[PDB]
């Protein structure tokens, strides 16, 4: 498919961390993370892209996701840090087995310690879910850096903090995937400071 370009690779413990530029629906990781809302309504953003790539129809993957959410949490909504796991379906041909749905906070141009802790849990949650299931590779989008309007540099910094604080032996590869080139250059600068 379209070009996947690794811009940075380093070891955080035994975990190999990569920063890549491209489409997360084409990244070769056993699990990819969705920047969802609390209802798993995949109506726009990377959520719509993942839902359509998995099921052909984004509305179908929304219903599949809502069924999984009730089965896994006993309710029809999730909070920051909680992760719903759904089959990747059509994405299996690219080596992706699961979608991990996470929900970041809505900054809307602001930033606070409350917003950071919510975004931190939304990044750490999928890492801990991968460790619980023995999933060896996981790829992340820039959760909350798009429609929810959190500053990209703060998002990438919070992501790196979750990776550095994560403790796990099953997870061997973590990737952050940025679509547009300008935001990927911003993320690379943050990666190199840290």
């Amino acid at each position: 498919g379209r070009p996947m370009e690794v811009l940075f690779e380093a070891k955080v413990g035994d975990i190999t961390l990569k920063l890549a530029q491209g489409d997360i629906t084409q990244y070769p990781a056993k699990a990819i993370v969705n920047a969802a809302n609390k209802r798993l309504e995949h109506g726009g953003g990377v959520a719509y892209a993942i839902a359509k790539a998995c099921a052909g129809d984004a509305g179908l993957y929304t219903e599949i996701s809502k069924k999984a959410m009730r089965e896994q949490f006993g309710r029809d909504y999730i909070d920051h840090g909680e992760v719903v796991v759904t089959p990747a379906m059509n994405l299996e041909e690219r080596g992706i087995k699961y979608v991990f749905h996470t929900v970041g906070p809505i900054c809307s141009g602001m930033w606070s310690e409350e917003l950071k802790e919510k975004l931190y849990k939304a990044f750490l949650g999928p890492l801990e879910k991968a460790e619980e299931m023995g999933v060896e590779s996981i790829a992340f989008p820039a959760v909350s850096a798009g429609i929810y309007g959190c500053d990209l540099e703060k998002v990438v910094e919070t992501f790196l903090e979750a990776v550095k604080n994560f403790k796990g032996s099953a997870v061997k590869e973590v990737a952050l995937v940025i679509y547009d080139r300008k935001s990927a250059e911003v993320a690379l600068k943050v990666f190199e400071r840290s």
Binding site: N37, K38, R39, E41, G43, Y77, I147
Partner: protein, 247 residues
């Protein structure tokens, strides 16, 4: 986009020529209109109603623009919803008022509206009959013979001897039971409240309340939206309610 005002000379004309057919307006200097918004956004056992904060602000500023003093109550149990309504019914400013608005927004079932702690195995429901009974002619004398407008947005999906004709008078309820499907677009909230505010802003200067509600319904009279058509319920008004914005 703001509330269009009715000129004062048309306010005196309609009050004089069609006095027997419209609800009387209290003189603005001694008038103390009261309105109440009860909105449940967060629930213990139900999905959150995102966008409700924009609906609260929109409805509050619309009612204040219609010269109502608006009390706002948020995230109440069914017990406390009933207590707030009974307290609102006893307010003395109603004696110096000509009308009132009640705006109730939450999850709903067929028989009533849900409180914050509702669950299907342990229900927390304020029955609709309890709402009308609290404000009827026997229990709320300060609003007797005065129009009582009840706007209800009760999203379905929360659960997976006619003394009434004599006492329940001058009510009108405008109800939307659409399941909560608000988009996660900052510029707006629910489509029902957005259309309600827009039609009030455009038509309150020339149309009475029932005509404004029909303008809202007309905006849903299209194939993609007709399933969500809001309904007029428990109508007991004896006259037309002209808001006369700005008067």
């Amino acid at each position: 986009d703001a509330l269009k005002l009715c000129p004062h000379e048309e306010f005196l004309r309609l009050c004089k020529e069609r006095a027997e057919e419209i609800y009387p307006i209290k003189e603005r200097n001694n008038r103390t209109r009261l309105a109440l918004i009860i909105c449940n956004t967060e629930f213990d056992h139900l999905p959150p109603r995102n966008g409700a904060d924009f609906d609260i602000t929109g409805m509050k500023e619309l009612l204040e623009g219609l010269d109502y003093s608006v009390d706002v109550e948020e995230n109440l149990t069914a017990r406390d919803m009933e207590s707030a309504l009974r307290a609102f019914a006893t307010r003395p400013e109603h004696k110096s008022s000509d009308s009132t608005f009640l705006v109730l927004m939450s999850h709903g079932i067929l028989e009533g509206i849900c409180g914050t702690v509702h669950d299907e195995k342990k229900p927390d429901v304020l029955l609709y009959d309890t709402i009308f009974q609290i404000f009827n002619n026997r229990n709320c004398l300060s609003l007797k013979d005065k129009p009582k407008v009840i706007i209800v947005q009760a999203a379905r999906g929360a659960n997976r001897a006619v003394y009434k004709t004599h006492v329940e008078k001058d009510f009108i309820a405008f109800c939307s039971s659409t399941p909560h499907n608000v988009s996660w677009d900052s510029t707006m909230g629910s489509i029902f409240i957005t259309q309600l505010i827009t039609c009030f802003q455009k038509y309150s200067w020339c149309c009475h309340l029932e005509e404004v509600f029909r303008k809202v319904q007309q905006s849903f009279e299209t194939p993609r939206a007709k399933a969500q058509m809001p309904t007029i319920e428990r109508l007991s008004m004896t006259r037309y309610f002209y808001l006369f914005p700005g008067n």
